[PDB]
Amino acid sequence: PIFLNVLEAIEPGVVCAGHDNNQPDSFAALLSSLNELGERQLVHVVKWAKALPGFRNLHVDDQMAVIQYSWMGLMVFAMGWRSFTNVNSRMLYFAPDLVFNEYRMHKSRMYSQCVRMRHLSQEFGWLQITPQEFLCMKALLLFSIIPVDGLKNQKFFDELRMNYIKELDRIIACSCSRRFYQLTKLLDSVQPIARELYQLAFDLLIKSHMVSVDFPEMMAEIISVQVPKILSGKVKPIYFH
């Protein structure tokens, strides 16, 4: 169980958004706290990724690129699990101090995306996803979006991605065929959700100075430098099906 030992050991702990819950639920306050949460979680995503088995086998530029393309999907998948285990999926548990009810879903102007995120959360229940399955699936999400022109050493990436697929297969194996199909269909469903959120993030950054929404340093950098490569089709998800 070496692989699962590692995934459990490096899983990030609780991250708070810093949200002042006694101010009114305005669009600007809610989106500014979500952006701050993203900035805080990005720190943990980087430290988590660098500690994954085999990750340092990747070229150093590929390491940062893969994090900078997959972070939305990783963060939404993890938030979906938090929601399933904490509020049982009619609310979104972005953080202990940033829990979206239906009112916040509307005031954030993200209601339809939150609905889809809620559906993703509920699938952990409908499919009875185990903690071990969640951990392996989340790791695989780091290796599920790349440039169409390929990475700087694509061969090492393809080997590492293969090995994470094998680990998922082992965790299921420890019926199997139906399970693997279910989990890979679930993984595929993350990318379209992440794409819609990437679109929202980009549009909000462009008009941020006018809706009074503050973007932290690394969020502003990644949404203006890397996210447009996804939105323009230069960086694309790897789907199973």
Q: Which positions touch ligand DHT (CB under 6 A)?
A: 31, 34-35, 37-38, 41, 72, 75-76, 79, 94, 197, 200-201, 204
37/235 with CB nearer ligand DHT: 37
Q: How far is the CB of 38 from ligand DHT (least distance, A)?
A: 3
Q: How far is the CB of 4 from ligand DHT (least distance, A)?
A: 24
Q: How far is the CB of 221 from ligand DHT (least distance, A)?
A: 13
What is the rounded distance in angstroms from the CA atom of residue 72 to the CA atom of residue 38? 9
Q: How far is the CB of 2 from ligand DHT (least distance, A)?
A: 29
CA distances from 26 to 38, 57, 186 (A): 18, 45, 33
Q: Give, as one character, the DSSP assignment of residue 23.
A: S
Residue nearest to ligand DHT (CB): 38
Q: Can you say how many angstroms the Cα of residue 136 is from the centroid of all Cα atoms in its chain?
A: 14
145/197 with CB nearer ligand DHT: 197
Q: Can you say how many angstroms the Cα of residue 47 is from the centroid of all Cα atoms in its chain?
A: 15
Tokens of residue 170, six digits: 């082992």
Residue whose entry in the numeric block shows the structure tokens 């008009």: 207
Tokens of residue 16, six digits: 């708070």
67/76 with CB nearer ligand DHT: 76
3/48 with CB nearer ligand DHT: 48
Q: How far is the CB of 180 from ligand DHT (least distance, A)?
A: 27
Residue whose entry in the numeric block shows the structure tokens 């139906």: 178
SS3 of residue 153 by DSSP:
coil
4/220 with CB nearer ligand DHT: 220
